[PDB]
Amino acid sequence: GNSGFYLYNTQNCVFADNTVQDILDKITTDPSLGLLKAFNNFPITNKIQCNGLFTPRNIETLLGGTEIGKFTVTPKSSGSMFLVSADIIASRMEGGVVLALVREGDSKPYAISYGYSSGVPNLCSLRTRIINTGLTPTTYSLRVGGLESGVVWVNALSNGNDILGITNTSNVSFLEVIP
Amino acid sequence: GNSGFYLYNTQNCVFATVQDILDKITTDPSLGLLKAFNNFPITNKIQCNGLFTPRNIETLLGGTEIGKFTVTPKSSGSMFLVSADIIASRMEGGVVLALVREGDSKPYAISYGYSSGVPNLCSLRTRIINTGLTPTTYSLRVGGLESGVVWVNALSNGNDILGITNTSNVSFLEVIPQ
Amino acid sequence: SGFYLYNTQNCVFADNTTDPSLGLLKAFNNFPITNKIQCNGLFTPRNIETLLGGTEIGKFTVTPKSSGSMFLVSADIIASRMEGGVVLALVREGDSKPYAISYGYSSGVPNLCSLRTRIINTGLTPTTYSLRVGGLESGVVWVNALSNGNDILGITNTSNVSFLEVIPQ
Ligand SMILES: [Br-]
Ligand SMILES: [Br-]
Ligand SMILES: [Br-]
Ligand SMILES: [Br-]
Ligand SMILES: [Br-]
Ligand SMILES: [Br-]
Ligand SMILES: [Br-]
Ligand SMILES: [Br-]
Ligand SMILES: [Br-]
Ligand SMILES: [Br-]
Ligand SMILES: [Br-]
Ligand SMILES: [Br-]
Ligand SMILES: [Br-]
Ligand SMILES: [Br-]
Ligand SMILES: [K+]
Ligand SMILES: [K+]
Ligand SMILES: [K+]
């Protein structure tokens, strides 16, 4: 109940009362998923004279036959295998052909197979499976020679000449599979 | 029309998801991402006295059994791609191979090979149509074409080839048709 | 401080499963060949790099499901001929010579003659291939039959050509 104007020090004042990509990277790089599988095919087109023999004395060493190819492969999944197919065009005077797949570091062949030529070229095959031991590149080589005796030519007639006058192709394929 | 001060009642106032897919993908048989593989090595030497003839080719009695294999598909509506790669010798002549599915009364698939006397690879390549996800058994029989004795994994006299044990293989790879 | 007029008014104042690019998705096709075919066409140095060598025994159409894929091809043909060489050639439609050539053998009795290769796919479109078989230089070759054209073991036999899609490294 009071109102008006008044001085406060020096002021005159009024006053008053008022996710797809994320899978994709996993899938293409996670080795533990059994998805995803390496494949490699290795053509062999050169004519190779295989003078090295296979015999009981060298069959369990590295010295049997003649090397015709060397292959490096890498698994993309853990605990996998490679299903291996070697299909080699070979000729020899009537007799047996031996094939040996060797894994680098071992002291003898990983797998041995047998083929035949009558004198004219014939496919000689090795089919096997490799047990992979990690995700590291691994190198394998294929050797080919006569069974006990004879010279074997790969990709050529028994004298070394071109079959049918052309270059021919033998193949070694590796297909990764999960057991 | 006014300014000043006034009383109002008593007041004086102024105014103026990844794991969820991954479990599916790694276990669902209907998607077709899961593919079985099995390889069966055969390393024993087996004398195959049983023959294949027109009278026994469509029975279970042709040739001699060299292996029996049990496999399980992981996907529905799948097939197995089969490769049997058998080392065999015989005196000059033909070799017959027959894959039999358990329960059937004759071979599923038949193939042919050759030996001149020295060992040679004899193969059978086929595809099997799978009918569920249950283990299934198959067997491989080998014998002469019409006549002759066939040795598997051995020379024509039963001895070791090159003095070692040799390996024949039968592989089954699961694949999905289109 | 006080009150004053500002204009008219009186105022207070104061100071305060379908993506091809992955690639899961792998086609498989198998083509059984069960007819007996008398392959009178020969392979010679003069026809080996043409379309005319041998005799066609099958034609296959396949479709890749993934990009930058290959088909792993296996042709496993039952064949007989009087003592000698068998030649197989896989041809891709539109080419003017074989994509791959392989060799087999018969002594007179049937034997498996194989061709194993890989094909490089170039898209996701159906593509047609064919297989041709014939003698090496001379001789008649019978597919799925004895060297005289009769049934082997008195039954129908089956040769196969398979295509399996795979993805290279
Ligand atoms: Br490749
Ligand atoms: Br020796
Ligand atoms: Br052969
Ligand atoms: Br296995
Ligand atoms: Br009979
Ligand atoms: Br059985
Ligand atoms: Br049946
Ligand atoms: Br022995
Ligand atoms: Br199919
Ligand atoms: Br047909
Ligand atoms: Br064509
Ligand atoms: Br061309
Ligand atoms: Br017969
Ligand atoms: Br694959
Ligand atoms: K021989
Ligand atoms: K090596
Ligand atoms: K012969």
Author numbering:
A (entry chain A): 2 to 19, 100 to 260
B (entry chain B): 2 to 17, 100 to 261
C (entry chain C): 4 to 19, 109 to 261
The paper states:
The protein Pgp3 is implicated in the sexually transmitted disease chlamydia and comprises an extended complex arrangement of a C-terminal domain (CTD) and an N-terminal domain (NTD) linked by a triple-helix coiled coil (THCC). This protein is both associated with the bacterial outer membrane and secreted into the cell cytosol, and is thought to be a virulence and in vivo fitness factor supporting Ct infection. X-ray crystallographic studies of Pgp3 from a genotype D strain of Ct have been reported at a resolution limit of 3.1 Å by Galaleldeen et al., establishing that the 84 kDa Pgp3 trimer is comprised of globular N- and C-terminal domains connected by a triple-helical coiled coil (THCC). Recently, Hou et al. reported that Pgp3, specifically its central region, neutralizes the activity of cathelicidin LL-37, an antichlamydial peptide secreted by epithelial cells and neutrophils in the human genital tract.
Here, the X-ray crystal structure of Pgp3 from an LGV1 strain is reported at the highest X-ray diffraction resolution obtained to date for the full protein. The protein was crystallized using a high concentration of potassium bromide, which resulted in a new crystal form with relatively low solvent content that diffracted to a resolution of 1.98 Å. Since the threefold axes of the THCC and NTD are not collinear with the threefold axis of a CTD, this naturally leads to disorder in the THCC and the portion of the NTD that does not directly interact with the CTD via crystal packing. c and anomalous difference electron density derived from diffraction data measured on the high-energy side of the Br K-edge peak to enhance the bromine signal, as well as the local structural environment of each peak, a total of 28 bromide ion-binding sites have been identified in our study. A total of 28 such ions were identified. These are basically all in the CTD. The most common form of interaction is via a hydrogen bond to a peptide NH. Our LGV1 isolate Pgp3 crystal structure shows where amino-acid changes actually occur (Q12E, T39K, P61S, D86N, Q90D, R138S, Y191C, R210S and I212T) compared with the Pgp3 crystal structure reported by Galaleldeen et al.. Of special importance is the lattice interaction that is observed in both crystals involving the three Phe6 residues on the fairly flat NTD surface and one of the Trp234 residues on the curved surface of the CTD.
